[PDB]
Nucleic acid binder design. Sequence first.
RNA 1: GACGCAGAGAUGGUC
RNA 2: GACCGGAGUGUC
Lengths: 365, 97
Amino acid sequence: GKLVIWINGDKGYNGLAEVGKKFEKDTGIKVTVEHPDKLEEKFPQVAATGDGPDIIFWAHDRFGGYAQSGLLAEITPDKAFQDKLYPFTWDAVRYNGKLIAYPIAVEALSLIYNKDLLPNPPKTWEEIPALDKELKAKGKSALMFNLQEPYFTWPLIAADGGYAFKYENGKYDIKDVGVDNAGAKAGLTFLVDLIKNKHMNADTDYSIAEAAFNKGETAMTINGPWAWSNIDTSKVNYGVTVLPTFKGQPSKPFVGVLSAGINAASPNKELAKEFLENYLLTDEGLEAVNKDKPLGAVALKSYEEELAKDPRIAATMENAQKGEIMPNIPQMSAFWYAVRTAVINAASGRQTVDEALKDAQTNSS
Amino acid sequence: SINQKLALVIKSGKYTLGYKSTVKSLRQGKSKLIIIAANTPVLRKSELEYYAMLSKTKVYYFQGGNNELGTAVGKLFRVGVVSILEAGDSDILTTLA
RNA sequence: GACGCAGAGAUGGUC
RNA sequence: GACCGGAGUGUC
Ligand SMILES: OC[C@H]1O[C@H](O[C@H]2[C@H](O)[C@@H](O)[C@@H](O[C@H]3[C@H](O)[C@@H](O)[C@@H](O[C@H]4[C@H](O)[C@@H](O)[C@@H](O)O[C@@H]4CO)O[C@@H]3CO)O[C@@H]2CO)[C@H](O)[C@@H](O)[C@@H]1O
């Protein structure tokens, strides 16, 4: 008679635990919040053996693959509840017409910059090479961001036309993949260009990029709302704005929707509904989670209305709109792992851009 | 759907029910596939999974407590584990495992 | 026929 | 207590 929740390490997991305390103090149910590494990779392998958790948190994309394997519980919220959360956020958590998880927030990457090292942030990517030499005089870099997960380099590869799966009359064509198109190459090339022209090291990851921006060592970074709290505490004067345009076109970040699905095999599915519906998805819950690590654009209308004024969320909302919503199909996993290796190998040297993307073009199906 | 597959193995081929009986079948390597109910205690699903591991036998995890297993195998009492020996017209060892 | 035990091995056996 | 044994079986 307990609820074991697995949430990602770069989220408000202490603040989600804080919501579990109210749930304990009001029923005596043990709400255990864990944040295990590679959780999205683990949940499928551990639920096939019946040793998984009750509630799992992740962006809507990894949930369709689970649903296709029957690892997710058919969530059953009433008509009144559905009209509390945005009609678009439910669509992100729908597999084969059935709702498989509860939407919690709309995520979107934005250009985070140091107002002290850069009052007017770049409007385009094409000016960054210059701005870097200018800052190399003051012994500082211009742009530092994680190049190990494709999610951060995707806004650039997608900008000029790159895509995952072609969307047609509702269904996604798993055979039409836009990672090899002329536009995709250009953007991935540009990334590899700043890399080759010593403007951005090809070994930089989340831990490094976060450290540099937060310690005043670089003008800007590309990150999500989660990374705000740690920036707020570094006492750095910073802003959250639109991503730079590449080839006179907007960057198209892959918009996630922090969903919370239930384990189809869980015995305490009934308790999960009470928790997620009447203790988390409310102005009180989201707030405690948002106070730990910001969610930004929230799925719940009530609390969203409150936070809207924040100019940081304005950016998130801006980028979220200018980009595209992540497909929830099972084939997303392949495309991701596939693009993962393209951005790395391409920038490392192993394969050239054309080679890296040509391989992802195939490995993606 | 598998509930029909189980039933089938029970009219044509041999099976066995219960903890004691299956562990024996694992030791003898006579069982091919085992089936353990969802909310089976930990020591036990560990001890089963363990003989299934030593015996090099496959394991299927039922999406419903022993209560529904008994119902699914033609019994009234609860059965937390099923050792499938040979399957006649049924295909659970050659389709899902 | 209700309760109680009973494949998570019952009653029942044998040392 | 240990072992054997596999579907019933004790009560009113
Ligand atoms: O190749 C080895 C690596 O494998 C693992 O990385 C995988 C993920 O497991 C996949 O799920 C996928 O990643 C996507 C992710 O699914 C998707 O939601 C999106 O995730 C963002 C998300 O918006 C947000 O919640 C935030 O927390 O960050 C995520 C990005 O880190 O985008 C991901 C793409 O990066 O593909 C990756 C690999 O490409 C494993 O986690 C790695 O540690 C391992 O090295």
